[PDB]
Amino acid sequence: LPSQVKVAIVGAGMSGLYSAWRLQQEANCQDLAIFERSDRTGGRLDSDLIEFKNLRSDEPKTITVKEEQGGMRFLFDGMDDLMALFLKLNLQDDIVPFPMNSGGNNRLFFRGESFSVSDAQQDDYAIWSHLYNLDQSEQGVNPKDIVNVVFNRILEANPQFQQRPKVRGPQFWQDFRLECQWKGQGLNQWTLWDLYTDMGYSQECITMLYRVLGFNGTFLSQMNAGVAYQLLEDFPAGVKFKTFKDGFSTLPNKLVEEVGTNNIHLQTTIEEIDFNEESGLYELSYAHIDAHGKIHKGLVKAEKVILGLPRLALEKLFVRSNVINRLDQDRSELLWNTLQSASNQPLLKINLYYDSAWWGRGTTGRPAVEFGPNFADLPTGSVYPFYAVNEELAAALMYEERTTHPSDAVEAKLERIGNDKYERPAALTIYCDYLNINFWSNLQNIGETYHNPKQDHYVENVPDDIYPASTAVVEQATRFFKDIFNTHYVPAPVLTSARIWEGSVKFDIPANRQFGYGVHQWAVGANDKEVMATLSEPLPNLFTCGEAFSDYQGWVEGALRSTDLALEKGFGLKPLSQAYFESTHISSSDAIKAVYEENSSKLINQYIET
Amino acid sequence: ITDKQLPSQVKVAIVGAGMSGLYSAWRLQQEANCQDLAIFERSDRTGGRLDSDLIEFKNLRSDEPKTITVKEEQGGMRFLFDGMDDLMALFLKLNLQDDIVPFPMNSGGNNRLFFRGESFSVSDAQQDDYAIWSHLYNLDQSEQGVNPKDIVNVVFNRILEANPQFQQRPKVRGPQFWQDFRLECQWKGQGLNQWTLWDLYTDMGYSQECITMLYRVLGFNGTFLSQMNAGVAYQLLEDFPAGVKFKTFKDGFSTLPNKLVEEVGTNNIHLQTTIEEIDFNEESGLYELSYAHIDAHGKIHKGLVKAEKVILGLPRLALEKLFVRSNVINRLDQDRSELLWNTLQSASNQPLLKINLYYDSAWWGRGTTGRPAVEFGPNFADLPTGSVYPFYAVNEELAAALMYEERTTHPSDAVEAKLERIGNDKYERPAALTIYCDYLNINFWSNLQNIGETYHNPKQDHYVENVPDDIYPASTAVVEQATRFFKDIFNTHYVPAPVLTSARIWEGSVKFDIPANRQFGYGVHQWAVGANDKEVMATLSEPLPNLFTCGEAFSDYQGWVEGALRSTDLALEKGFGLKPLSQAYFESTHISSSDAIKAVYEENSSKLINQYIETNFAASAA
Ligand SMILES: Cc1cc2nc3c(=O)[nH]c(=O)nc-3n(C[C@H](O)[C@H](O)[C@H](O)COP(=O)(O)OP(=O)(O)OC[C@H]3O[C@@H](n4cnc5c(N)ncnc54)[C@H](O)[C@@H]3O)c2cc1C
Ligand SMILES: Cc1cc2nc3c(=O)[nH]c(=O)nc-3n(C[C@H](O)[C@H](O)[C@H](O)COP(=O)(O)OP(=O)(O)OC[C@H]3O[C@@H](n4cnc5c(N)ncnc54)[C@H](O)[C@@H]3O)c2cc1C
Ligand SMILES: [Cl-]
Ligand SMILES: [Cl-]
Ligand SMILES: [Cl-]
Ligand SMILES: [Cl-]
Ligand SMILES: [Cl-]
Ligand SMILES: [Cl-]
Ligand SMILES: [Cl-]
Ligand SMILES: [Pt+2]
């Protein structure tokens, strides 16, 4: 319960932990503290470890499902800050594949018709002509290949944009959206809806576009077209995403240990930020619920202030705080408009757990649904299968990342392992954005809290950070699963969770029962070179960082890079990828690929081949 | 004529020169003798969300009339003689009754529909038991062979049958009914205010293909996808009874607030005066209103007005801005201020927009298309246009024709010919198309508006005699796509460029320094999921002692001027002891305002029909 600190960090998200960690390590500022709003660290990183009772055997005592309510995946290219963080933190031996497809057998459900990725391919993509009244010119082409055709049109309209990096990372995309024009106007002045239309595409075609992709905010929200293509063309050809074995929460979990649980104060809401004139310290007025559930209002002084906060928290602090008025109005207006520049993008994940996976060939008569998104123009948006932690399955996925062409024997081993996973506990995730949020988030307040009566027959221990879905959600989830997997058989989940990442301004819903917005993306007209400059140090010795106003939004790496900019401006710390390269003479990506290649080889030799 | 010089102290400080704040002052003056009030309005115009366009075209086919006028509306439009008794009384007590004219809603089936890539008529969609919707949507068997719109009727009946304890069945389903409906009827154990329509239909088993069909054919998709509760959603939808006979004003809806200014006195209304924060001084006992004024030469004066009573005829977002910026939201029970803040969040902000394309003549008539002409009423599409309304130049003979058609009956031979001729005539005068849409389509137009050059027909002065200044034209991009959609909706390749356009986006910003007056409130408000509006209305009628709130935003009858009226009637009852206007009217006349206005309108339409259509025995002429 400190009273003064050299450096006050607000938010135990990734932005605030990474800050604490870089200051303690590389600048030896051992007079800091993180004040966190809720009763938990990690922010929009919430992973779930649920353990089931083995009902079919006895050799495994319990089995364990790893489910993600927030972040799930990362990549070895384009995220050199995150790979550096992983490596310096020694989390690299826990990285496993996050496969994204089932060789064509993932489901698609559109305009009342359920079918597969291989199916939609048939007959020169003919089915899309049947579900949508497309122009002749939009017939006979993979829908998702239209996104590449538009991208290539933009490039051919912008000869001055000669940037063609092997990896199209944040820098590239910032340059793309601020320097590239359509019809004389930079892409940050356009939406995809207006762009595609202007280009001559039919509205049937556009609707087909923002349905197949699962997320529609790229077309129907206020985000601009240039940042839209950062999120689309983040999926090149053979993308091999990765995750952590025990869930993404291992990252902030490990950052907690290295920072010290005694330097982090949960359930402490910083309420206003004043600046003391004579003393020269920032004064941060807080509100802290003790271990006995009773409120204290108090104050903490600071020489330097680090807000690892998303847009809506910042605005709440702007409105409430006393320093806004202690400021030039034109400047204060600038700040506000600066805060209005990245759109809030609500997301939700709903997780349904089963005693075993019913979407396999054995129980549907259709080609097994394995991994990756099952896309539908229902309110589900995307649906992702998640399976129980199994070291042998992880190793088979590692063999298949370089699938190449296995021998007949490996193909048999692979079929066996893929089959085994359907007999262990598993779970499905509904994951959607923008237009579908309202469907699920009010349906969540309809009905009772869902409780499988035989839930103790199945699960040994459920954690506390699990807020179940309503009976209404489980009914409609089940009705949409029947449609998507084209099956009569969808049993009741043994266990459910709901998470609506949509910011609120309403008092007295339980503080840890509601959560900030999912992600943020640069709005129309925002110039983010300018806004990031302003937000790194909007006030002397007050800094801001996080995913919200980053150049890699929607991803931890954005929070990382954005915090690197506040540490550079404030404490002269070189970017983390860059400090790593100069001490090792190998980029964090080349190192992580080397180390993972070794680990994967060790697992492939122990469970699959040689 | 309005000018500027500001008072230091007043008994009653009215914030806002919208319908609500103008109405406040008028009732206070007439019915309370409160001649110590002032109206401080944010912008350079009275009326609020009520913005009529008067546009003089050159008459090029004659010299007989020098100019021809197209009354277009960027804001308020239309009203009903039933269910709107405060507005009917207001009309009468202000002597506006002789201006009312019909507001037609159909072309006898010739209106267009454009869905899932196909263009067709209202008559087409009815053929073969509504077959076409089964071809455009992958509907379940039990949602086939029915008018899409009747599914809304059937669900309405089903909610009642499921609520036998709700026995209210009035001849006019008014604000009181719908409030009781949304707060007393339940579905699966939960009040309708706990439901969205999206969730509700999906629970009742409708396919998503059906629900999509529904929210596109209704023209407005906010009743399903926004956060307004299923209860108030039905108030909007079943506000259209059997024979829909809407009324509007001859010269446009600006008639109303303009007349109110003349009666309250322009010297009491200070334009370009934004109230910024409200404190409460305890020793003097008066509210303190920090304002900012732009004088006639674009120069700012900062000052204070005191008041014993304060009246906020402001929508949600304006109230929120005052709340955040104000001092009397501190020094209260934090539980109190939090209750007020949450209370302010209970009405969803619903954006709306209108984009008006004007033509020297109506190219969508029989003679320039070779097909059955489109006449009046919305043309519906799942394109981003939403609804498309044709509007015609003011013509008193045309209004007499419509006053006759209203009472459809059975015209003689000679009358049927005159009506046909009058309807052909409206296509040979200047006319306008109006794109009108909400929620999900807002982002299409509002961002497209920021694309391209400002639209300007170079030969516009050949056609237009006087354009106002509160006309902000549409981007060239907006004109291009607007044309693209018209080509589809109207099933032709012949959509000429307009001579003039205007765009009006009723969507709030929280940004400082938006173009100019571009700061426009949200379009309407509808009660959100979970909102008990009975309680909210009580709270907001006097959230602070001697500080009152009113307007459409948190009203009985959202979306409508009548809502602003009934809400203000509640603040005036609460603070100055004034019975509702429709009730005070009734007690002074012993006839309801709706009965009284119906009578008057009957006589006036009699006079006009005798002047232009039929002298009762033989047809008239001109
Ligand atoms: C559904 C979803 C899926 C995602 N998937 C991925 C993925 O696959 N890969 C990926 O790389 N990224 C993913 N992300 C992004 C990732 O979750 C975030 O970008 C990252 O955690 C950003 O952290 P941050 O510190 O910037 O913000 P946050 O983690 O949101 O941290 C903000 C913190 O500040 C606290 N706070 C706010 N106001 C106050 C206050 N006044 N006082 C005290 N504390 C306060 C909050 O409680 C919170 O702990 C996903 C996000 C979501 C929502
Ligand atoms: C497109 C559209 C069509 C409509 N059509 C119809 C129709 O056909 N029939 C019908 O009955 N209704 C219709 N309406 C509804 C009608 O516009 C409103 O219901 C009604 O005008 C509500 O007025 P009000 O006084 O409550 O608020 P407003 O009209 O919004 O007035 C508020 C005023 O307060 C001022 N103000 C705001 N903040 C401040 C501040 N801080 N200080 C000082 N002044 C401030 C604003 O400048 C504004 O003039 C329509 C609305 C729209 C958007
Ligand atoms: Cl089991
Ligand atoms: Cl696939
Ligand atoms: Cl094309
Ligand atoms: Cl019609
Ligand atoms: Cl659709
Ligand atoms: Cl066309
Ligand atoms: Cl056409
Ligand atoms: Pt079809």
Side-chain angles (χ1 to χ4, degrees):
Chain A
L1 274 74
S3 308
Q4 295 204 35
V5 307
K6 180 125 164 210
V7 158
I9 307 173
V10 175
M14 291 283 339
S15 191
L17 292 162
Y18 179 74
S19 295
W21 186 69
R22 294 212 60 192
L23 293 174
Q24 278 170 343
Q25 296 308 316
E26 315 155 14
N28 195 64
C29 212
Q30 313 295 2
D31 191 17
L32 54 72
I34 307 177
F35 316 103
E36 160 60 40
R37 191 200 41 180
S38 77
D39 67 340
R40 58 173 279 272
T41 66
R44 292 175 264 170
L45 247 59
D46 196 336
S47 281
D48 288 343
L49 280 207
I50 304 264
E51 63 169 329
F52 288 66
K53 291 156 171 201
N54 192 2
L55 303 167
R56 219 275 211 195
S57 154
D58 50 11
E59 200 199 24
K61 304 79 209 194
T62 66
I63 320 179
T64 294
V65 179
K66 180 270 283 172
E67 191 59 52
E68 309 271 17
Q69 281 186 104
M72 36 187 38
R73 57 197 211 266
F74 46 87
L75 288 165
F76 284 174
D77 316 64
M79 282 165 84
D80 296 4
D81 257 5
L82 187 69
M83 303 325 322
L85 182 53
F86 285 175
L87 283 163
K88 221 192 140 192
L89 265 174
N90 240 344
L91 306 183
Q92 68 280 308
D93 313 292
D94 287 345
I95 298 171
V96 298
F98 200 86
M100 286 298 280
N101 80 81
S102 314
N105 297 318
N106 271 337
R107 305 304 303 168
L108 292 164
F109 183 102
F110 293 92
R111 304 252 162 122
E113 298 289 325
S114 165
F115 48 95
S116 85
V117 174
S118 317
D119 290 348
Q121 202 170 323
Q122 281 316 88
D123 287 321
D124 275 300
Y125 295 101
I127 193 168
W128 303 108
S129 278
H130 292 297
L131 305 173
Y132 296 87
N133 210 356
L134 308 164
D135 199 51
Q136 191 194 233
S137 79
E138 299 139 5
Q139 298 183 326
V141 294
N142 197 328
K144 299 148 291 251
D145 179 48
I146 308 176
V147 171
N148 299 312
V149 174
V150 168
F151 182 80
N152 286 338
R153 276 174 195 167
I154 288 161
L155 296 194
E156 292 307 282
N158 287 261
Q160 78 286 13
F161 195 77
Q162 292 140 26
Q163 224 153 333
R164 291 302 192 289
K166 208 261 145 194
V167 153
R168 279 177 316 218
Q171 209 261 347
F172 170 88
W173 291 113
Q174 201 201 70
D175 285 357
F176 173 81
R177 79 176 150 280
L178 295 169
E179 295 168 11
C180 281
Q181 57 78 30
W182 195 253
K183 257 59 176 274
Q185 281 172 253
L187 298 181
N188 69 326
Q189 268 58 245
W190 287 93
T191 69
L192 284 193
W193 202 352
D194 301 1
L195 183 65
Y196 273 65
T197 298
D198 174 56
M199 259 182 213
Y201 281 111
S202 89
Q203 292 301 303
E204 275 298 87
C205 189
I206 286 165
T207 305
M208 177 189 65
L209 256 307
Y210 68 76
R211 293 295 179 177
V212 310
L213 301 151
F215 281 23
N216 36 69
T218 38
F219 285 77
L220 307 172
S221 82
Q222 302 253 23
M223 80 192 246
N224 70 57
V227 63
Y229 266 97
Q230 188 178 13
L231 286 176
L232 305 183
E233 300 271 318
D234 208 83
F235 287 95
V239 286
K240 302 286 171 275
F241 289 88
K242 268 71 183 175
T243 168
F244 275 121
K245 171 184 82 163
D246 283 1
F248 219 143
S249 283
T250 54
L251 175 54
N253 278 1
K254 181 61 165 143
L255 275 186
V256 153
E257 295 157 13
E258 303 289 308
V259 172
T261 76
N262 282 357
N263 302 178
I264 293 169
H265 306 279
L266 322 176
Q267 294 191 177
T268 320
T269 293
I270 302 303
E271 273 177 335
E272 46 246 80
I273 284 172
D274 215 331
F275 179 63
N276 192 313
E277 187 169 1
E278 276 245 16
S279 94
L281 302 171
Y282 279 98
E283 270 149 27
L284 278 40
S285 300
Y286 62 72
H288 170 250
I289 285 202
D290 54 12
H292 291 33
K294 260 62 201 74
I295 306 99
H296 322 273
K297 298 243 194 178
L299 210 154
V300 164
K301 311 203 186 196
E303 269 190 17
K304 293 164 175 151
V305 178
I306 291 182
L307 301 184
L309 299 183
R311 173 187 155 188
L312 170 59
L314 285 172
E315 295 165 337
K316 282 166 168 244
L317 258 176
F318 187 105
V319 154
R320 222 308 205 179
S321 74
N322 211 10
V323 158
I324 65 153
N325 289 45
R326 191 185 279 267
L327 171 61
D328 185 355
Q329 159 260 4
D330 298 93
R331 180 66 178 154
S332 71
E333 285 189 22
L334 170 68
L335 280 193
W336 183 257
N337 294 346
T338 315
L339 289 174
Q340 302 323 293
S341 55
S343 61
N344 304 288
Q345 299 274 343
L347 299 177
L348 61 84
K349 285 178 166 342
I350 290 134
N351 296 330
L352 284 79
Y353 303 73
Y354 302 100
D355 74 290
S356 57
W358 42 262
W359 43 101
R361 174 78 180 237
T363 52
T364 73
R366 313 199 173 272
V369 176
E370 264 160 313
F371 310 91
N374 310 279
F375 288 123
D377 70 355
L378 304 172
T380 49
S382 72
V383 186
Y384 280 82
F386 278 64
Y387 300 99
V389 311
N390 199 265
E391 194 168 75
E392 178 193 48
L393 169 58
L397 298 183
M398 293 164 185
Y399 183 98
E400 297 193 68
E401 265 167 340
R402 29 202 165 181
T403 297
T404 49
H405 286 332
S407 76
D408 275 350
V410 188
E411 179 188 35
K413 211 165 272 152
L414 297 190
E415 188 184 10
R416 202 263 307 168
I417 288 150
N419 283 341
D420 287 358
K421 75 180 170 291
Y422 296 110
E423 321 231 42
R424 298 193 278 276
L428 277 183
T429 283
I430 293 165
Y431 181 34
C432 63
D433 78 333
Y434 199 69
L435 181 74
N436 293 307
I437 291 291
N438 272 358
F439 168 88
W440 293 106
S441 69
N442 309 297
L443 192 61
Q444 174 54 20
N445 288 270
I446 292 299
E448 309 230 291
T449 280
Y450 177 84
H451 193 259
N452 192 306
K454 340 268 173 203
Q455 147 173 347
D456 302 358
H457 192 26
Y458 292 99
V459 177
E460 185 85 47
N461 165 43
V462 291
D464 317 318
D465 68 309
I466 306 292
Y467 306 71
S470 77
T471 58
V473 168
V474 170
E475 199 182 320
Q476 304 310 323
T478 298
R479 285 210 316 125
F480 294 147
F481 292 158
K482 285 175 179 170
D483 280 332
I484 292 178
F485 302 100
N486 198 20
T487 171
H488 286 323
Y489 179 60
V490 178
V494 319
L495 196 96
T496 58
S497 77
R499 181 56 50 80
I500 299 154
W501 301 104
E502 165 176 60
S504 200
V505 294
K506 298 193 268 202
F507 305 85
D508 205 65
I509 198 69
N512 205 35
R513 178 36 177 74
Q514 214 49 267
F515 300 77
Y517 279 104
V519 294
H520 306 75
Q521 322 278 323
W522 293 117
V524 180
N527 190 276
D528 47 298
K529 263 181 198 145
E530 261 155 30
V531 315
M532 270 155 81
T534 308
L535 294 204
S536 60
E537 203 184 354
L539 273 76
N541 282 342
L542 168 138
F543 309 88
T544 278
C545 47
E547 166 275 342
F549 295 103
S550 85
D551 38 14
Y552 209 13
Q553 295 162 316
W555 300 95
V556 172
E557 177 85 5
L560 294 191
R561 303 168 51 78
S562 186
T563 296
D564 271 1
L565 185 88
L567 299 167
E568 193 164 19
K569 200 88 39 174
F571 309 71
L573 314 183
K574 279 214 313 281
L576 184 99
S577 85
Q578 192 199 134
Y580 184 81
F581 174 86
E582 299 177 2
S583 104
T584 82
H585 304 78
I586 176 176
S587 50
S588 65
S589 45
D590 280 337
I592 198 85
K593 293 177 189 198
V595 177
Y596 177 77
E597 220 267 1
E598 296 304 339
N599 270 288
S600 46
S601 279
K602 166 253 310 177
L603 276 183
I604 308 201
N605 277 337
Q606 204 198 337
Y607 290 101
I608 285 97
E609 199 168 53
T610 282
Chain B
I1 317 186
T2 315
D3 326 301
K4 59 144 285 304
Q5 50 93 352
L6 267 154
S8 313
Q9 299 132 28
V10 286
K11 218 190 100 203
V12 159
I14 305 174
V15 176
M19 262 335 276
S20 183
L22 288 171
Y23 180 75
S24 301
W26 178 72
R27 296 207 62 201
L28 285 173
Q29 278 168 350
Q30 306 303 309
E31 310 169 15
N33 201 42
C34 209
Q35 292 291 7
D36 189 10
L37 60 80
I39 293 173
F40 315 95
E41 156 66 55
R42 182 207 80 200
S43 64
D44 64 322
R45 63 182 262 284
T46 60
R49 282 176 256 166
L50 212 156
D51 202 351
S52 284
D53 307 17
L54 274 276
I55 293 204
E56 280 175 23
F57 286 74
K58 291 159 177 198
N59 180 355
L60 289 157
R61 298 145 206 253
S62 312
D63 49 10
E64 297 129 46
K66 281 110 163 154
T67 75
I68 314 176
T69 300
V70 182
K71 78 96 177 158
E72 188 53 54
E73 309 258 20
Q74 290 162 355
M77 263 309 339
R78 52 198 229 196
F79 46 88
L80 273 199
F81 289 156
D82 306 279
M84 276 186 215
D85 301 10
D86 270 353
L87 189 76
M88 285 330 141
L90 183 55
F91 288 174
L92 283 168
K93 260 318 201 283
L94 277 186
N95 213 242
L96 295 182
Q97 61 282 313
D98 301 274
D99 251 18
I100 307 176
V101 291
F103 191 91
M105 280 317 261
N106 72 77
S107 308
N110 294 310
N111 277 353
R112 304 307 293 168
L113 289 156
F114 197 99
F115 298 77
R116 298 257 169 109
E118 301 299 321
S119 172
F120 49 101
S121 82
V122 176
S123 326
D124 292 323
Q126 274 171 18
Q127 286 335 105
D128 300 327
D129 268 307
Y130 311 100
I132 195 166
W133 307 107
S134 287
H135 295 276
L136 302 181
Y137 299 84
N138 215 9
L139 310 170
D140 175 302
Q141 166 160 19
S142 77
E143 56 216 13
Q144 298 175 335
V146 297
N147 190 327
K149 289 146 216 125
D150 265 289
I151 299 185
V152 173
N153 286 131
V154 168
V155 168
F156 180 66
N157 292 337
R158 281 172 198 161
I159 287 157
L160 293 179
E161 265 222 336
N163 278 275
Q165 92 277 358
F166 189 71
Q167 292 134 19
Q168 279 174 255
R169 302 297 191 286
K171 196 275 162 192
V172 163
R173 270 180 276 91
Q176 175 261 347
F177 172 85
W178 290 118
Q179 181 179 68
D180 290 351
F181 170 93
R182 85 176 84 86
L183 304 170
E184 279 175 6
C185 280
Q186 46 97 332
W187 185 264
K188 310 236 195 138
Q190 279 173 266
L192 287 183
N193 70 330
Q194 304 312 319
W195 284 89
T196 59
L197 280 197
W198 205 356
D199 286 358
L200 182 69
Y201 280 62
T202 283
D203 180 280
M204 319 193 32
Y206 282 91
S207 82
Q208 298 307 312
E209 273 298 275
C210 194
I211 282 165
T212 298
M213 182 193 54
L214 286 186
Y215 69 69
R216 296 294 186 162
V217 297
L218 293 159
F220 275 30
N221 52 71
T223 44
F224 282 86
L225 315 168
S226 81
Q227 310 209 63
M228 63 159 97
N229 64 52
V232 64
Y234 253 114
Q235 178 174 22
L236 305 185
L237 291 179
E238 301 275 326
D239 210 69
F240 287 59
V244 291
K245 258 46 162 302
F246 282 95
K247 297 317 168 305
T248 189
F249 270 144
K250 163 163 23 193
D251 278 341
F253 224 143
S254 286
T255 320
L256 183 58
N258 277 7
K259 183 69 163 82
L260 270 192
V261 189
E262 294 157 359
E263 291 293 308
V264 283
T266 77
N267 25 65
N268 306 297
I269 307 184
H270 302 82
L271 321 169
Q272 314 203 35
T273 309
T274 290
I275 302 300
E276 278 165 346
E277 68 186 335
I278 293 158
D279 208 342
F280 187 44
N281 163 304
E282 181 172 22
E283 50 185 79
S284 84
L286 308 195
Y287 285 98
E288 281 162 0
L289 277 77
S290 312
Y291 59 77
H293 183 72
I294 296 190
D295 59 33
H297 308 316
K299 302 290 174 280
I300 288 101
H301 305 258
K302 274 198 272 159
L304 200 185
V305 164
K306 304 212 182 200
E308 262 203 5
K309 295 169 176 271
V310 157
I311 290 169
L312 304 181
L314 296 187
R316 186 185 166 194
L317 164 60
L319 269 315
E320 287 162 344
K321 290 192 235 228
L322 265 171
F323 185 97
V324 152
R325 171 108 164 91
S326 274
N327 201 17
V328 76
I329 75 148
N330 290 271
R331 282 315 192 88
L332 312 79
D333 187 2
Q334 185 195 285
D335 288 274
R336 180 72 198 171
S337 65
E338 282 169 7
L339 197 142
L340 289 321
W341 178 259
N342 285 358
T343 302
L344 291 176
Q345 305 319 285
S346 74
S348 67
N349 289 93
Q350 303 279 339
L352 305 171
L353 71 85
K354 287 197 190 224
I355 300 190
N356 298 328
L357 281 77
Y358 299 83
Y359 307 86
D360 67 287
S361 58
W363 41 266
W364 54 91
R366 177 68 179 238
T368 46
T369 71
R371 306 200 187 275
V374 170
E375 276 159 321
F376 317 89
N379 302 272
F380 282 131
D382 71 0
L383 298 174
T385 56
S387 54
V388 176
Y389 290 80
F391 281 93
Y392 305 84
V394 202
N395 185 266
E396 186 155 89
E397 182 194 45
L398 165 59
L402 298 172
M403 282 178 190
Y404 185 91
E405 279 167 46
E406 256 172 343
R407 312 136 165 98
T408 290
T409 45
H410 284 334
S412 76
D413 259 357
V415 179
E416 188 98 50
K418 272 304 120 211
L419 293 192
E420 195 176 19
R421 190 266 294 147
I422 303 186
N424 301 333
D425 277 3
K426 71 177 182 294
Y427 299 116
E428 298 146 26
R429 294 185 273 270
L433 281 189
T434 290
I435 296 160
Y436 183 30
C437 73
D438 85 326
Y439 207 66
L440 163 83
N441 289 303
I442 292 285
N443 275 348
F444 175 87
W445 294 102
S446 72
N447 289 292
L448 194 55
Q449 179 52 27
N450 285 291
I451 296 288
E453 204 154 326
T454 282
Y455 180 83
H456 181 61
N457 192 310
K459 296 184 160 134
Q460 148 179 344
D461 291 3
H462 197 257
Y463 290 113
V464 202
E465 179 77 36
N466 164 43
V467 305
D469 312 325
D470 58 309
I471 282 198
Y472 306 82
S475 80
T476 52
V478 165
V479 167
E480 288 161 9
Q481 298 312 315
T483 304
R484 252 193 51 187
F485 301 142
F486 294 166
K487 279 173 178 172
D488 275 310
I489 291 177
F490 292 89
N491 179 41
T492 174
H493 278 310
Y494 177 69
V495 181
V499 318
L500 191 76
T501 79
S502 73
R504 185 47 74 64
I505 317 186
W506 297 95
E507 162 184 56
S509 277
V510 306
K511 287 210 275 199
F512 311 93
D513 208 63
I514 208 79
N517 220 329
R518 178 71 173 88
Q519 70 254 351
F520 293 168
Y522 275 96
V524 280
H525 299 82
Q526 334 283 347
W527 293 108
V529 172
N532 187 283
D533 59 287
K534 269 191 203 150
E535 278 162 6
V536 157
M537 276 166 112
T539 282
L540 299 186
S541 74
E542 208 195 2
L544 277 296
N546 299 307
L547 198 162
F548 317 82
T549 267
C550 48
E552 171 271 351
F554 306 89
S555 85
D556 235 8
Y557 198 172
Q558 297 160 323
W560 297 93
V561 165
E562 172 85 8
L565 294 186
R566 298 173 54 81
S567 174
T568 298
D569 269 5
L570 170 53
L572 301 173
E573 166 152 17
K574 201 83 150 199
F576 309 80
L578 302 169
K579 289 196 208 303
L581 184 75
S582 72
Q583 194 182 112
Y585 181 85
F586 192 68
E587 299 181 345
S588 166
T589 81
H590 301 71
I591 165 174
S592 137
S593 67
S594 61
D595 272 344
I597 184 91
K598 281 167 189 200
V600 172
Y601 182 68
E602 225 45 43
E603 250 298 314
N604 274 318
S605 48
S606 264
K607 178 203 95 77
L608 268 165
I609 287 163
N610 279 89
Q611 188 176 170
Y612 288 93
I613 304 306
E614 212 183 23
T615 75
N616 288 335
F617 224 125
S620 212

